[PDB]
Amino acid sequence: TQSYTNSFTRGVYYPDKVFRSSVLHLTQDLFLPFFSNVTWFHAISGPVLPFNDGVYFASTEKSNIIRGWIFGTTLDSKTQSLLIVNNATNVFIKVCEFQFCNDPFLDVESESGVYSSANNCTFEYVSQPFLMKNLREFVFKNIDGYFKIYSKHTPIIGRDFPQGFSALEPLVDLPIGINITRFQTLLALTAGAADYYVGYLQPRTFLLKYNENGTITDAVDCALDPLSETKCTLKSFTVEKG
Amino acid sequence: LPFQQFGRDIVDTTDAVRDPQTLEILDITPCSFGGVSVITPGTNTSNQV
Numbered sequence: 001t002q003s004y005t006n007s008f009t010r011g012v013y014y015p016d017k018v019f020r021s022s023v024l025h026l027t028q029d030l031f032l033p034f035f036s037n038v039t040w041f042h043a044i045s046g047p048v049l050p051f052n053d054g055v056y057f058a059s060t061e062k063s064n065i066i067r068g069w070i071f072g073t074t075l076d077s078k079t080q081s082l083l084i085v086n087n088a089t090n091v092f093i094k095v096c097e098f099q100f101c102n103d104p105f106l107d108v109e110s111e112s113g114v115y116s117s118a119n120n121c122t123f124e125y126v127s128q129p130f131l132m133k134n135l136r137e138f139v140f141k142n143i144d145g146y147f148k149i150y151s152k153h154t155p156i157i158g159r160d161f162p163q164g165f166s167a168l169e170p171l172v173d174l175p176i177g178i179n180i181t182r183f184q185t186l187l188a189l190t191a192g193a194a195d196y197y198v199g200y201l202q203p204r205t206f207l208l209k210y211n212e213n214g215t216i217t218d219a220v221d222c223a224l225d226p227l228s229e230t231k232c233t234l235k236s237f238t239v240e241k242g
Numbered sequence: 243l244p245f246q247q248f249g250r251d252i253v254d255t256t257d258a259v260r261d262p263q264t265l266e267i268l269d270i271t272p273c274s275f276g277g278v279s280v281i282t283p284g285t286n287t288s289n290q291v
């Protein structure tokens with residue numbers, strides 16, 4: 001099932017590790033435009049989800065059936081594909097070519113239920129798993145080969161998409177460069193339902209605000225409405241009459 | 243911040259840095275500089291300055 005909901009003012013992450021104090025720094029980078037369309041995939045029991053320069057992901061279910069992601073070009077044994085599985089104890093990262101299975105899924109816990117075979121697979125990396133009423137936000141983008149994942153865990157209210165402001169801190173990075181064109185989530189599995197949101201990132205310009213502690217508190221999306229353009233031109237959050 | 247180590251002033255210059263070995267916060271200040279002025283009466287009066 002598919003629907004549409006307003007993106008509101010969510011999807012802001014720290015662009016770097018540079019400390020700033022009481023600054024209104026203006027950054028030009030990839031972000032999620034304010035008040036956009038996010039495809040709400042809810043109650044799917046059993047798609048494609050084409051991958052671009054940047055994507056978005058958020059979920060709040062406690063069923064733990066949502067885990068892992070697949071990246072690649074054709075999802076075939078003729079082209080290398082990046083498979084990431086964040087299971088309970090660690091995370092699996094590998095670059096391998098295979099025909100996969102009938103449907104890539106974790107046979108609850110046979111990882112062979114996703115991939116059928118392997119090829120030249122010199123690279124293999126294992127790290128701390130991402131898992132550690134609540135809302136989980138993630139940002140997956142691949143720039144100049146480097147794979148960056150930003151995440152944050154916040155206590156949600158209810159089960160619908162809430163409001164408010166919260167910035168995402170970077171967690172991991174990896175310099176593995178391969179042709180990535182399509183991505184698809186993984187479900188471990190008798191019927192059921194699941195809910196998650198997908199957004200697309202575009203190159204925009206923002207006006208971040210750092211408090212005295214260096215924490216992001218507010219942002220302004222330039223080129224959205226004339227007031228935002230005025231604020232970005234003045235580099236201020238309050239405008240006098242004129 | 244736990245993941246931040248660099249510093250930045252109002253515009254473009256570093257003013258803080260974190261010690262790579264131990265978790266320390268310390269500033270950076272450029273070494274002193276300035277102009278030099280000479281005070282003197284006329285050479286028809288004296289030669290000390």
Ligand SMILES: *[C@@H]1O[C@H](CO)[C@@H](O)[C@H](O)[C@H]1NC(C)=O
Nearest residue numbers: 004005006007035036037038
């Ligand atoms: C999303 O797309 C619909 C048309 O498909 C459009 O009417 C709407 O303004 C767009 N934005 C939001 C926030 O719904």
Ligand SMILES: *[C@@H]1O[C@H](CO)[C@@H](O)[C@H](O)[C@H]1NC(C)=O
Nearest residue numbers: 072073074178179180181182
């Ligand atoms: C990468 O994948 C795209 C999508 O299938 C394909 O068109 C392209 O030829 C592949 N290789 C390069 C170098 O882009």
Ligand SMILES: *[C@@H]1O[C@H](CO)[C@@H](O)[C@H](O)[C@H]1NC(C)=O
Nearest residue numbers: 087088089090091092109126
């Ligand atoms: C979870 O991932 C770790 C990573 O090495 C692996 O050792 C472990 O077997 C996995 N758990 C299961 C149940 O397969």
Ligand SMILES: *[C@@H]1O[C@H](CO)[C@@H](O)[C@H](O)[C@H]1NC(C)=O
Nearest residue numbers: 080095096119120121122123
């Ligand atoms: C395996 O070898 C082929 C032969 O050129 C190469 O194209 C492919 O990238 C290799 N696989 C990996 C994971 O490097």
Ligand SMILES: *[C@@H]1O[C@H](CO)[C@@H](O)[C@H](O)[C@H]1NC(C)=O
Nearest residue numbers: 211212213214215216217243
């Ligand atoms: C930053 O530190 C100051 C001084 O302790 C504190 O008042 C402020 O609340 C802190 N801001 C945070 C933790 O976001």
